[model samples]
Target: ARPCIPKSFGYSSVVCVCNATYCDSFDPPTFPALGTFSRYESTRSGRRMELSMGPIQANHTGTGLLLTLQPEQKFQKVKGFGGAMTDAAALNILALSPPAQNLLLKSYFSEEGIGYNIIRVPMASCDFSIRTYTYADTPDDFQLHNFSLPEEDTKLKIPLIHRALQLAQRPVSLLASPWTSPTWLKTNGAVNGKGSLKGQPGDIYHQTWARYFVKFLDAYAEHKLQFWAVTAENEPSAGLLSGYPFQCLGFTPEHQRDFIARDLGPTLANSTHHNVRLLMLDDQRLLLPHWAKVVLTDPEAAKYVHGIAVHWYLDFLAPAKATLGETHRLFPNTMLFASEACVGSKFWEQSVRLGSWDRGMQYSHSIITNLLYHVVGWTDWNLALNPEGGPNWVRNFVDSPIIVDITKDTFYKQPMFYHLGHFSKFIPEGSQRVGLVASQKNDLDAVALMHPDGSAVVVVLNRSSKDVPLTIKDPAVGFLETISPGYSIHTYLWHRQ
Candidate 1:
């Protein structure tokens, strides 16, 4: 049996689907004139249909004709990842350190009770900065010989992360990515510059790097934990130029494939650490084809590697379609999860300063676009941060869903949290993407799903500035429903009559 949709708001407001009054007031004519529109839907038996307009050209008839619904295509199934760095700040501000571990535990556990199933932790340090650290901290030549988690992490980072997971009702997946390796390994012998370890040792450093993986795994397992995946490096390409802390390694796919398949993958497999997966290329989608060539072409590496991970720094959503489209043909088993994304508060500060209503729409658009392309899971960058965006040890600061005020021991939750809650709390694991057909007006977008229990969910987003009317057609399934545009996102879940 499938679980019925819960009425609890979690952290967001939830309106009943049968509230016709809200539906009646929705006007469709006020929407903006952007030409792109698409929809997704699914049948009771699991078949899906997805249709679109605007990539087509047609001379205007007095009035536009409605297009028939097309078959829905399947997209990537998500695993899950998010929450770690931000919470560290939460602990620091709340004074949940040595004196208040017990108090912090209560709030930490409460988050899971509310349903946060995926967690991400940096290997050492990033802009999230509970502190600056590295696993392999030693001389360049001494490499691989020195790698360890600093003792201080246990005080804040570890406790916060573990308490959250322990409170989860279901198993949660953890992902770890490093900001920078030891200072010795980088070309500048510093953690915050664009430098990579020259792959000169071939077999030797390969084994050494593998040892680093082994060490991290052992430490976490001691606490009775294992990671779901490891991004070889976080935004390796961005590190090349961003002057961001834990800068890029400049390690191309060739460098990654060789180390993972021959070194890391085999090491983990031999250790019976089957729970951990080695995910290559955690950069943006535009670099995917380049990475794919390396993983796909190499036989040994291909077998050992998990699917490629992507970020949403770029605006194009087609990469999801392109990557998912190719996976079925070449690497069917590899999974796709959007690893990192954040609202560049610097770029969109106006929206946040404006109101929750505006913030809500920005997040809705990102989710709809990513979901359309086959991104199985979507993860926001930081879960919590300070008002300025950081204590910023690395000099890189960004906002997150929750912003904590250490001075006040208080936090603010952004509308984005509610936006994510709309999906995460209801769209349980194993849910499949069925299909949907957009309305002829083309101002709205939607995707349908068959919940594991046989129920259906249709999520719609109106991206235009003005309202637009929408009507769903699937007599084979149920009655049609209309949607309204303009700063609105609506999800419909139902049981067939």
Candidate 2:
């Protein structure tokens, strides 16, 4: 005889998917109460919490998408989610009033805000800086005698970072990347435009650049800021954009491998900051597989690197999901991070598009797609920016979730802020991505994670033009029925019993 399945084990789950008009009567049923599941949604029409509800019976009565999840099948552990803290971001925050600044910091770092836990900082100056600069300006300073944090950073960036740390009330991981080395150490003898490190592998400039990274960590330590990781370079293949504008440093895969294996890797291993992780290729995702194979295939180079950092820009040319998956498949042991992303002149052709819901949805879709792949963490391009999207020296402004109106001494929380909060707030660090099975419906995207607190968080997105029925079934929790409105995002949370 076949094994008998329990009557309670196969209970039918049902949900009513309807438009906003029917939202009132269909209240989300309480779990285990034999009723419907509650859902919160943010859409272009407007944001709504507890908009509608339905039952989780075993019957399929709606013509909407079906989402099945296996909480038992877990995947990558999330490192964290957050944005970058460029000089422009910091200066913009300083531009606000004292009360406004406090509120702004709390908005990003506090639980009352989006609860950001990971922060990216530039090692030296980038395009976001008021002007191009570096810690060491003196030529032939192999010993790095002239190395020191620029006054602009000491006065603005460091203090803003300290404030954020205090607001976080939890240890925050810092990842630092350099747009370019000091002008003296580059082939062009200038920070702006495309340039390569001076000399060949194992040469004076190569060795000095390695030391430059160490000195930076030391300086941050003096200010009580400890960096968790550092990338070799920002846009390592950006040489073609050379002399176009802003800070761009080009490092071929071979050059990066040589630097890590011959200089940086061993240097850090022998230094007081040995625990600091060294991440490679802080560039677009299209080059991930190529770079990963070049560096990680070599044991010498691979041993010195911790993981790969990727960006989202190239996804427009080709989907990043495949490349990111391939990169992880090739180097499963290495962690992958979505290091930088934003709507900028490069794509949007507009620095700041205020009150744009489409922009927010773009962020939600990208984060969900990336997490579904093997990306361990996602970091936005900027934490905060002025109304115009920057104090960018190169005028390369970009939109941020929190945009400050310096003229009014206030800040506006864009829809992107809540969209990010949908993830960063519920799916925090230590959460592991769990298995999710849904139809190949292009309009519907979903992902689930099992939090360390014995809770499961499910994030769903509805990109269609009409409300759709969504049924989520979990073996541990049985089933849940919720309505996903058109052009809206929803996040569901429940304890795993």
Judged by TM-score, which candidate is best?
A: 2
Q: Give the range of the ten consecutive residues with the poorest summed lDDT in model 2.
A: 1-10
Residue 409 lDDT in model 1? 46
The lowest-lDDT stretch of 10 consecutive residues in candidate 1 is 17-26
lDDT of 2 by residue, 1-497 (tens): 11111111111211111121211121222332324444556666545333344455555556556787887787899999999989888888888777778877876787655578999999878888888878888877779988999866698878988999898855689999988888888888777667888888688888898999999999999988998999988888885455748776778999988888998898889999999998999988888788899999889999989989998751254576568998888889999998998875655355676566667778888899899888999999888888678888888778888777787775666667768878886677899999988854657878899888767778887767788877787766567777777878898876555
Clashes of 1: 21
What local lDDT score does residue 111 receive in model 1, on the 0 to 100 scale?
33
Winning candidate number (lDDT): 2
| lDDT (Cα atoms) of all candidates against the true structure | 0.55, 0.77
Positional deviation of residue 435's Cα in model 1 after best superposition, in angstroms:
1.2
The superposed Cα distance between candidate 2 and the true structure at residue 189, in angstroms, equals: 1.0
**Compared with the true structure, what per-residue lDDT tens digits does model 1 show for residues 1-497?**
11111222232322111110111011111211222223332111111121222212222222332322232444454454345544346444445233333333322223321245677777766656756667766676455655666754555567666766765555778887766666665666667766665455347655666667778878888777778888777777655664555434556677777777777778878875766887777777767666777776888888877767777642233445565455444565666667877654456343123123445555656666666666667777766666577656654665455555455544444545545655554455666777676435576666666556545556666666666555444433433334354545655554432
Cα error, residue 229 of model 2, in Å, equals: 0.7
